[PDB]
Swiss-Prot record, chain A:
Function as written in the Swiss-Prot or TrEMBL entry: Forms an icosahedral capsid of pseudo T=3 symmetry together with capsid proteins VP1 and VP3. The capsid is 300 Angstroms in diameter, composed of 60 copies of each capsid protein and enclosing the viral positive strand RNA genome. The attachment to the host cell receptor induces virion internalization predominantly through clathrin-mediated endocytosis. Binds packaging signals present in the viral RNA.
Source organism of the structure: Ljunganvirus 1 (LV)
Name of the protein this chain belongs to: Capsid protein VP0
UniProt free text on domains: The N-terminus mediates the interactions among pentamers. In order to facilitate delivery of the virus genome into the cytoplasm, the N-termini of VP0s have to be released from contacts between pentamers and exposed at the particle surface, resulting in capsid disruption.
Assembly: Interacts with capsid protein VP1 and capsid protein VP3 to form heterotrimeric protomers. Five protomers subsequently associate to form pentamers which serve as building blocks for the capsid.
Length: 222, 212, 51
């Protein structure tokens, strides 16, 4: 009949006049199941939000000139805009993100077409103003050029880059990848005009902090 | 023989390169630039020091703002990152952190002392902290004289971004002054020079604004 | 320009005609933040449902 404390993750329990616990006869608390009824690895559940997901496809046609914008992605708000995405449910609690980013631009061009899209990365405080930047210089950014011919995929890794130490989930704070027309495509006839572009993203180095009520926004850095 | 050269392996060296595979952007920095039979690549230092090095270039200060002060009331003066000068070379980078010098230059027809104080947070920290500037790091400047006082980095934002004009985290600071000694037409001029800057991440070269 | 496969958790990606990846100059991918702006332990998020 003494003081018993109990602590799990955030919550904690300080009890007075405790009673010794009970357990069923011959208990076995080993978590894993052997033999296995599931082939998956038991670390799946926490790992799951890291899964790579289709993101914001766009359609790039003839008519669009240079400097035009094919598609747009707001980076940090991109992985859970809806309830459908895997990282949503667990991001609907914790209010901050230290996470790094992995985005793989998928593209398919029918052989015999020529032109280029550029996949760049613009952080938020940069993204605030397009009007300042010369177009010819966008290659200063972390980026990858994509040739129509002989490029299936463009793999670019983005480390966390932002002013404040931690960034708010529900906002745009990480900025986002914007895909621009480096040169117009050239189509011989007959060919399908629209060349579909799908930005197939991912996420790595998962982090969350600073609990909040499920639906409510909270200010942190400002 | 002497004149001719041939492939087929080293055609990389003669300048044929696939831009589609760039590696990292920094991987291109390692790339050996192409050369023909006759070119001599030699690094020739005409000066001992390098004007190209980040440390040196921003040592030269640059002039931001001029105003006369006839009134003892505390003067709000806001410092944007440099435009229209060699300081604009810093416009390539968003994130910047480092301590910065301030050279203020006092001109007083009638003898006047003037005070200088700097606050990274603006006038409003959520309370008005501008009531008296004595406690915030004031450094007093004699009449017809100037001083080199430098400001340490105190910010709740570890990295200032150059581009934005937003008063909260964007600027490199906000400067406070007031005259003392019952005077008028005390005129100041203030110069801002960085010290051992740390610039992080690049941006594309900015457009010249004719329309502002 | 070869076959590149990518696998994370359940999802996986099999690409042909790949291009070597890019990263910003002098990247540092270490997850944790030192000094720390948060006193919590970084294993909080997956642990959280146990609360």
């Amino acid at each position: 009949d003494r003081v018993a404390a109990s602590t799990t993750t955030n919550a904690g329990n300080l009890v007075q006049a405790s009673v010794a616990p009970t357990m069923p006869v011959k208990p076995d608390f080993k978590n894993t199941d052997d033999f296995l009824s599931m082939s998956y690895r038991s670390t799946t559940a926490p790992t799951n939000p890291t899964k790579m997901v289709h993101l914001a496809h766009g359609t790039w046609t003839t008519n669009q000139h240079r400097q035009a914008l094919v598609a747009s992605i707001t980076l940090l708000q991109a992985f859970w805009p809806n309830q459908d995405f895997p990282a949503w449910g667990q991001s609907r609690y914790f209010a901050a993100v230290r996470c790094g980013f992995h985005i793989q631009v998928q593209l398919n061009v029918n052989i015999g077409s020529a032109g280029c899209l550029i996949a760049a990365y613009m952080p938020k405080t940069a993204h605030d103003h397009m009007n300042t930047y010369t177009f010819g210089s966008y290659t200063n950014l972390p980026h990858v050029l994509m040739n129509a011919a002989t490029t299936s995929q463009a793999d670019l890794y983005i480390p966390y880059v932002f002013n404040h130490n931690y960034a708010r989930t529900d906002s745009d704070d990480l900025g986002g990848i914007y895909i621009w027309v480096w040169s117009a495509l050239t189509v011989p006839s007959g060919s399908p005009t629209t060349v579909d572009v799908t930005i197939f993203g991912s996420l790595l180095d998962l982090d969350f902090q600073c609990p909040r009520p499920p639906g409510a926004d909270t200010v942190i850095y400002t | 023989n002497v004149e001719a050269a041939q492939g087929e392996e080293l055609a990389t060296e003669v300048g044929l390169r696939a831009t589609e595979n760039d590696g990292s952007l920094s991987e291109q920095l390692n790339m050996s630039q192409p050369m023909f039979l006759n070119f001599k690549k030699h690094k020739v230092n005409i000066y001992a020091a390098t004007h190209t090095k980040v440390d040196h270039i921003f040592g030269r200060a640059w002039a931001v703002g001029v105003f006369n002060t006839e009134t003892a009331a505390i003067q709000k003066f806001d410092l944007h990152f440099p435009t229209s000068t060699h300081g604009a070379l810093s416009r390539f980078f968003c994130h910047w952190t480092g301590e910065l010098n301030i050279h203020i230059l006092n001109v007083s027809t009638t003898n006047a002392f003037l005070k200088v104080a700097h606050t990274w947070f603006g006038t409003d920290s959520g309370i008005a902290r501008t009531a008296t500037l004595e406690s915030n790091g004031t450094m007093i400047i004699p009449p017809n004289e100037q001083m080199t006082l430098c400001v340490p980095y105190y910010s709740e934002v570890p990295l200032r971004c150059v581009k934005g004009s937003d008063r909260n985290s964007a600027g490199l600071g906000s400067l406070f002054t007031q005259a003392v000694g019952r005077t008028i037409s005390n005129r100041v001029q203030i110069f801002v020079s960085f010290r051992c800057p740390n610039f992080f991440f690049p941006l594309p070269a900015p457009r010249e604004a004719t329309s502002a």
